[PDB]
Design a protein around this ligand. Structure first.
Ligand SMILES: CCCCCCCCCCCCCCCCCC(=O)OC[C@H](COP(=O)([O-])OCC(O)COP(=O)([O-])OC[C@@H](COC(=O)CCCCCCCCCCCCCCCCC)OC(=O)CCCCCCCCCCCCCCCCC)OC(=O)CCCCCCCCCCCCCCCCC
Ligand SMILES: CCCCCCCCCCCCCCCCCC(=O)OC[C@H](COP(=O)([O-])OCC[N+](C)(C)C)OC(=O)CCCCCCCCCCCCCCCCC
Ligand SMILES: CCCCCCCCCCCCCCCCCC(=O)OC[C@H](COP(=O)(O)OCCN)OC(=O)CCCCCCCCCCCCCCCCC
Ligand SMILES: Nc1nc2c(ncn2[C@@H]2O[C@H](COP(=O)(O)OP(=O)(O)OP(=O)(O)O)[C@@H](O)[C@H]2O)c(=O)[nH]1
Lengths: 175, 120, 98, 320, 83, 49, 52, 63, 347
């Protein structure tokens, strides 16, 4: 739907999110969230976070899960899981479709969905503003300020990563 | 409670106006207790290390007593400061809200009834 | 509160349930453990981009970055479990019974 | 200071000190099979610090004057008692072995500390890995019981795991009729009372289990007593080898810091030797333990920590 | 002297990439301190007008601010025009 | 001497102990000093003495 | 915070991006800069209790 | 010693504690009244300072 | 592991915990939390035994879940406020969502399940860090946002902690486990007064640290892990178990032994806030803590237990560990009660 395109983007984000959170095989679970990872990028891309959308592809989508799928390769269960192997995973999946299709329909209704928070599930296109960005890109300028305004943020991130590499080797060598 | 008062520069163990109070005397009973605790640390240290506790080195115990006496005196000033601060701003407040604390009139016990309850 | 925000909010809620409601294989939780921060990362970008909080574009990257060290910490502990029991199955993850 | 973190930080390694003459030699054999003399011969030929065979008062000959203490005050067991009475009720049999195993274990720690602080090899008789052959043999004829074995090997696994196996083992092969005829030549009245059954059990336990169980940890240098006499023969092929087996020819300064942490802490090497397993032959009730410990207290030197005894003559107590 | 020159000699003899890599980072960190052009770089990086040069209320007592882009007073960047 | 080996504390470690008195004498002299002007300052801050 | 070390030393550690009306790269305004400025100026040295 | 010693010393003892007793009750009720309102020195929970806002003109005319 | 990295791995744990209390930004609050977690795991894995790996997995899974849950306490806060400043929470849903996040990092309500198991798996030295230093950081955040905290939600977490913490210790024989359960019970005490007056929470934290330090190095000096192993310690070192008895009673809270000071102040503070049922049940169930407390004292020094022949070996050798700050910790944790009015210093 053109008007609510991000809503379709958002809905696809959760159905894949439910699928892999339903504890399927790690390879299958990888598929469930990478499509969720890709579709979530479109949501950020549609809002204007060009770098943030493209960057989650490179370190999370093409990053995180490649070494993650690497780990499931050496796990190599003799009985790899398929969605039909257990009925619990199907029960979660048909559930994940159930309440999702439930309250989006209730969202399609008078629009007073009030689970936990108060939500007005109107068309997502309304929330934007009418202010131009001139020449500077708002997202690009913000991240570029890491080296001018992010003085403490960069130091702890750099320090922790150096701690990160030493701790990884310290706990994998096995004394 | 304190934390957040006006003029409360943080990480300060003794603000400047705290010095306008009578400093504790070196023979303060609270202070001599600090010295007593330090001495008891010296006995434990020798007992822990299996040494003749009573006179197992007069250097280790001397540092124990002096260090506790030192840290006590500075703690005492901050102790004395905050309690003085706690009562001080109260008096400013008690004169800042006269209507909240009205003086109840005084009537001697020649008027107030106490419905004496006999005991049997 | 706009629908897109609701969709991500529930996305974590199932992820929180998915990690908490556990299964035999410990891998799947680790996917869901960092999956839950992906929704955190995704929605975080949404508010900052919506609100034109230029400086707060700091958070979306660094939020994921330390979430990576945790995932990096995650499977690194996992291989030790696999090197001691054979599978990361969590029903055998009970050596500390006593 | 010792290998305590500061010394390791300032660059003090241990592989720097290690040389080709850095090995653990277990010159074992049979009961009085002449291995004691061979221990000295090997030690003096390649310049290794020799350790006399661990006994009951070995730990007594480590602290203070390095002199034997009262048997009641140290050990409470008597090998002569076991030699005279085979199956008594006082429990000298098992208690002798467990105290022996601890004394050998302390000897192992002293050996490693010397090697890890000098880089020079060490030779030991009847290493703590051997010890189990005696105890199981004592069980064969009934000196100890089934429930006795459970305490000993429980101490064995919790203690001997971290200590690295030796590099060289010399099994001086002496056959049973020779030993059963030589024990008359010794003449010490306690060791005449040795049963051929107890002897027969110790050798077969040795060849069948002592050599093979740690063969994969270091090579087996079998040497007949005839080979033991010719010390010139045994000194060639100890050098003719590398001892790639076991984990010793893999360790680095990373593990050596851990190893010298434990051996330096003499209390730590044997902290696990006192496992709260309440075996009747070693469990000492409070009343006897209190009185004995009180007897240990007012002994010279032992009253305070070392260097803090005014009775011995340690001046400057009021300052040190 | 002897050890340092010999250490560099075998380092380039056996680990030429390591010497090249360590050298390149060696320069890359120090010349900017002594670089005279970096002061030009910051000036041009600031002389790039992104937002509008918003006006100011001309009520007198500010003579330096020009009343026109083609006025003499004000920041002239002809140095960059020649840089 | 009873002990076969010199124990790590079985000797007066002159440098260490001399530091310990050095710590204390500096500590007390600071303490008696600090109480002096702190009292003196309090005397004049409120106008007492 | 618990120990406001930044206030004592004066060094800006995290105050730069703590709110959306602070200094911004190339003076990019937030969506609610006017409201945040009005609110933040209303509650200065007033205390969280009564400023609510 | 004389009963005057005990009489006047108790006389001072009772005055000291009564002054203490009055302040203890006064401190409790002020603290309650102070926490609810907060228009005074203590119990002032932190708020963001004015200094950290940007008064310089932005790119968008209004802001 | 190698001491130099072992030094800096622990050293960052202070740095991460330091950052939690010295940063006014919500992001940096999480920043120090997970730098702290990143360097905590290897210290757990220092021994490298299957139990040590077992303990690390439970701790990481618990701590990682809470911190990611902590972000969305921040995220909704940002979603409804636009403020990253560490002050009054503006969203009730985020506020509870935050409290469960921090409570799990502290382990008071049934989030506490990892506290005994994780403690037992790791070594005694690592147990010291886990129950003493990696507890200030969650309490640091709670102290700042205490005014806003939901009274019913926080107090409910507190009682369930001490109630379970009291009951759990009555059946554990391992010294580490009973140590952990008593730590849970104390943690309920501090967080109970937390909404009322944070100064008493800090005083409880400062006091509670003293015994937990003092008890741990005493056990490390004793090199004992189980009650029977503690029983033998009287023979070799009758003095050490004697001081352990004194500090053990101080942890129980019997006057004049300092340790009753926090409990005394908590009862008085809650009473001033008209809450009088809260302290009574809180104090009454503190007796549950005292039972297995005295039970340890019964087997430690009060009645000499049977020893073993090999213990004769240990008398000959002297201790090599340095146990720094032990004598001061014992003394400061048993007799500081007359210096109670030093509470104003913490204000
Ligand atoms: C409140 C009032 C009371 C508290 C007052 C404040 C003092 C609190 C601590 C008291 C002492 C605690 C202690 O040591 O107990 C013995 C206990 C056991 O000591 P141990 O028997 O020697 O064994 C320790 C290791 O297993 C031995 O392992 P190792 O052999 O590898 O040796 C490691 C050790 C040995 O030392 C070294 O190796 C030195 C470092 C060498 C490399 C680095 C050089 C440069 C160092 C710069 C440091 C600055 O190095 C360290 O511990 C390094 C960390 C030191 C702190 C660094 C901080 C800056 C970053 O100590 C520990 O387990 C250490 C835990 C971490 C510190 C204490 C944390 C608990 C208290 C926290 C709350 C404090 C109150 C907060 C309010
Ligand atoms: C360590 C090396 C990196 C830090 C020191 C060198 C860089 C200093 C710096 O950028 O300071 C920025 C700031 C001071 O800012 P400044 O004045 O240098 O630059 C301000 C620039 N505008 C106006 C655009 C915002 O200081 C810090 O970030 C100090 C952080 C702590 C440093 C010590 C950690 C230990
Ligand atoms: C609040 C209520 C009370 C709370 C605390 C209660 C504590 C005791 C409770 C019971 C404890 C369990 C049961 C008994 C356990 C005994 C433990 C023990 O080790 O006992 C035997 C041991 C033998 O003594 P030893 O260790 O050799 O030391 C001798 C002195 N160097 O004995 C010892 O180790 C004890 C050594 C004690 C040394 C005391 C030295 C005192 C010195 C005082 C100097 C005073 C100077 C005064 C100056 C005045 C003018 C300024
Ligand atoms: N129970 C027990 N006794 C042991 C052990 N190792 C050595 N012994 C005893 O140590 C004593 C001395 O060993 P012997 O072989 O008899 O004599 P020796 O003088 O050492 O002679 P060599 O063996 O030739 O060096 C004997 O009583 C042995 O039984 C052991 O592991 N257990």
């Amino acid at each position: 739907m053109t008007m609510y395109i991000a809503f379709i983007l958002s809905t696809i984000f959760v159905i894949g999110f439910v699928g892999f959170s339903s504890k399927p095989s790690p390879i299958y679970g990888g598929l469930g969230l990478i499509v969720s990872g890709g579709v979530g990028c479109g949501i950020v891309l549609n809002f204007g976070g060009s770098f943030l959308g493209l960057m989650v592809f490179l370190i999370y989508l093409g990053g995180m899960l490649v070494v993650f799928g690497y780990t499931t390769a050496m796990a190599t269960e003799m009985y790899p899981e398929v969605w039909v192997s257990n009925k619990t995973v199907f029960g979660a999946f048909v559930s994940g479709l159930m309440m999702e299709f439930c309250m989006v329909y209730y969202a399609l209704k008078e629009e007073e969905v009030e689970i936990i928070f108060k939500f007005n599930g109107l068309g997502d296109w309304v929330i934007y503003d009418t202010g131009d960005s001139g020449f500077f890109s708002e997202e690009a300028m913000g991240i570029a300020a890491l080296y001018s305004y992010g003085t403490w943020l960069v130091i702890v991130t750099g320090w922790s990563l150096l701690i990160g590499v030493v701790v990884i080797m310290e706990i994998t060598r096995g004394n | 409670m304190m934390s957040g008062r006006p003029g409360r520069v943080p990480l300060q163990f003794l603000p400047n106006e705290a010095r306008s109070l009578p400093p504790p005397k070196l023979t303060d009973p609270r202070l001599v207790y600090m010295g007593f605790l330090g001495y008891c640390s010296g006995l434990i240290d020798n007992a822990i290390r299996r040494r003749p506790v009573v006179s197992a080195g007069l250097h280790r115990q001397l540092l124990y007593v002096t260090s506790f006496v030192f840290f006590g005196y500075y703690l005492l000033k901050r102790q004395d400061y905050m309690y003085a601060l706690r009562d001080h701003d109260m008096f400013a407040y008690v004169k800042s809200h006269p209507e909240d604390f009205p003086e109840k009139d005084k009537k001697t016990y020649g008027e107030i009834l106490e419905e004496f309850h006999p005991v049997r | 509160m706009p629908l897109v925000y609701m969709n991500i909010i529930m996305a974590f809620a199932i992820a929180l349930a998915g990690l908490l409601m556990y299964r035999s294989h410990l891998m799947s939780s680790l996917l869901c453990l960092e999956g839950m921060m992906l929704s955190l990362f995704i929605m975080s970008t949404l508010i900052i981009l919506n609100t034109h909080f230029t400086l707060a574009n700091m958070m979306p990257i660094i939020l994921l970055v330390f979430a990576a060290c945790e995932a990096a910490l995650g499977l690194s502990l996992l291989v030790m479990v696999s090197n001691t029991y054979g599978t990361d199955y969590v029903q055998n993850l009970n050596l500390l019974q006593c | 200071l010792q290998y305590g973190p500061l010394a390791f930080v300032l660059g003090e390694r241990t592989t720097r000190k290690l040389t080709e003459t850095s090995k653990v030699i277990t010159v074992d054999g049979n009961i009085c099979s002449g291995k004691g003399r061979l221990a000295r011969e090997i030690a003096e030929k390649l310049g290794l610090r020799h350790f006399p065979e661990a006994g009951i008062h070995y730990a007594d000959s480590t602290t203070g004057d390095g002199k034997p203490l009262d048997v009641q005050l140290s050990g409470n067991c008597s090998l002569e008692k076991f030699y005279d009475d085979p199956k008594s009720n006082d429990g000298n049999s098992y208690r002798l072995q467990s105290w022996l195993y601890a004394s050998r274990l302390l000897q192992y720690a002293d050996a490693l500390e010397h090697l890890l602080s000098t880089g020079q090899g060490v030779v030991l008789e009847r290493s703590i890995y051997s010890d189990f052959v005696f105890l199981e043999a004592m069980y064969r004829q009934g000196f100890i019981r089934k429930q006795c074995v459970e305490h000993y090997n429980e101490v064995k696994k919790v203690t001997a795991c971290e200590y690295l196996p030796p590099h060289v083992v010399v099994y001086v092969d002496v056959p049973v009729p020779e030993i059963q005829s030589r024990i008359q030549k010794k003449g010490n009245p306690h060791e005449m009372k040795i049963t051929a059954a107890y002897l027969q059990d110790i050798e077969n336990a040795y060849k069948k289990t002592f050599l093979p169980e740690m063969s994969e940890k270091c090579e087996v240098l079998q040497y007949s007593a005839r080979e033991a006499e010719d010390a010139e023969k045994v000194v060639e092929d100890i050098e003719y080898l590398k001892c790639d087996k076991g984990p010793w020819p893999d360790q680095d300064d990373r593990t050596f810091h851990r190893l010298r942490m434990l051996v330096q802490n003499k209390l730590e090497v044997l902290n696990y030797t006192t496992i709260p397993v309440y075996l009747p032959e070693i469990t000492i009730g409070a009343h006897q333990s209190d009185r004995v410990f009180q007897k240990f207290t007012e002994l010279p030197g032992r009253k305070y920590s070392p260097g803090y005894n005014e009775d011995v003559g340690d001046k400057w107590i009021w300052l040190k | 002297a002897g050890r340092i020159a010999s250490f560099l000699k075998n380092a380039w003899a056996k680990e030429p990439v390591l010497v090249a890599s360590f050298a390149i980072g060696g320069l890359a960190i120090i010349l900017p301190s002594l670089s005279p052009y970096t002061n030009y770089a910051i000036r041009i990086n600031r002389a790039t007008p992104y937002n509008y040069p918003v006006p100011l209320r001309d009520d007198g007592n500010m003579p330096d601010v020009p009343s026109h882009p083609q006025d003499p007073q004000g920041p002239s960047l002809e140095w960059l025009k020649n840089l | 001497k009873f002990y076969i080996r010199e124990p790590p504390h079985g000797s007066p470690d002159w440098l260490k102990v001399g530091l310990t008195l050095g710590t204390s004498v500096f500590l007390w002299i600071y303490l008696i000093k600090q109480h002096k002007e702190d009292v003196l300052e309090y005397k004049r801050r409120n106008g007492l003495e | 915070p618990f120990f406001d070390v930044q206030k004592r030393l004066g060094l800006d550690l995290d105050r730069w991006m703590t709110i959306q009306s602070a200094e911004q790269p190339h003076k990019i305004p937030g969506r609610c800069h006017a409201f945040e400025k009005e609110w933040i100026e209303c509650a200065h040295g007033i205390g969280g209790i009564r400023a609510e | 010693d004389g009963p005057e010693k005990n009489y006047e010393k108790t006389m001072a003892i009772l005055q000291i504690e009564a002054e203490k007793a009055e302040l203890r009750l006064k401190e409790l009720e002020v603290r309650r009244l102070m926490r609810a309102r907060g228009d005074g020195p203590w119990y002032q929970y932190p708020t963001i300072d004015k200094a950290l806002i940007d008064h310089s003109p932005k790119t968008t005319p209004d802001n | 592991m190698n001491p130099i990295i072992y030094t800096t791995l622990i050293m960052t744990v202070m740095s991460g915990t330091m950052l939690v209390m010295i940063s006014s930004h919500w992001l940096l609050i999480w920043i120090g939390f997970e730098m702290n977690l990143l360097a905590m795991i290897p210290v757990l894995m220092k021994n490298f035994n299957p139990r040590a790996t077992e303990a690390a997995t439970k701790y990481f899974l618990t701590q990682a879940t809470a911190s990611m849950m902590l972000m969305m306490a921040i995220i909704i806060n940002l979603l409804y406020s636009g403020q990253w400043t560490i002050t009054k929470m503006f969203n009730p849903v985020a506020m509870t969502m935050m409290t469960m996040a921090l409570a799990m990092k502290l382990g008071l309500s049934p989030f506490h399940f990892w506290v005994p198991e994780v403690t037992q798996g790791i070594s005694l030295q690592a147990g010291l860090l886990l129950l003493t230093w990696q507890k200030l950081a969650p309490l640091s955040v709670l102290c700042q946002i205490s005014q806003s905290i939901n009274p019913n939600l926080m107090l409910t977490m507190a009682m369930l902690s001490i109630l379970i913490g009291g009951w759990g210790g009555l059946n554990q024989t391992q010294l580490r486990k009973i140590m952990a359960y008593s730590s849970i019970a104390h943690m309920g005490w501090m967080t109970a007064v937390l909404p009322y007056n944070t100064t008493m929470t800090i005083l409880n934290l400062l006091i509670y640290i003293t015994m937990t330090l003092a008890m741990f190095m005493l056990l490390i000096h004793s090199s004992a892990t189980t009650t029977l192993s503690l029983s033998h310690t009287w023979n070799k070192m009758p003095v050490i178990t004697s001081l352990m008895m004194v500090t053990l009673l101080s942890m129980g809270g019997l006057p004049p032994l300092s340790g009753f000071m926090p409990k005394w102040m908590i009862i008085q503070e809650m009473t001033k806030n008209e809450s009088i049922i809260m302290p009574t049940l809180m104090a009454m169930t503190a007796l549950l803590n005292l039972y297995f407390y005295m039970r340890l004292a019964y087997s430690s020094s009060l009645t000499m237990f049977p020893s073993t022949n090999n213990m004769k070996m240990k008398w000959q050798f002297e201790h090599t560990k340095q146990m720094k700050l032990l004598p001061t910790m014992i003394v400061l944790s048993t007799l500081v009660l007359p210096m109670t009015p030093a509470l104003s210093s913490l204000n």
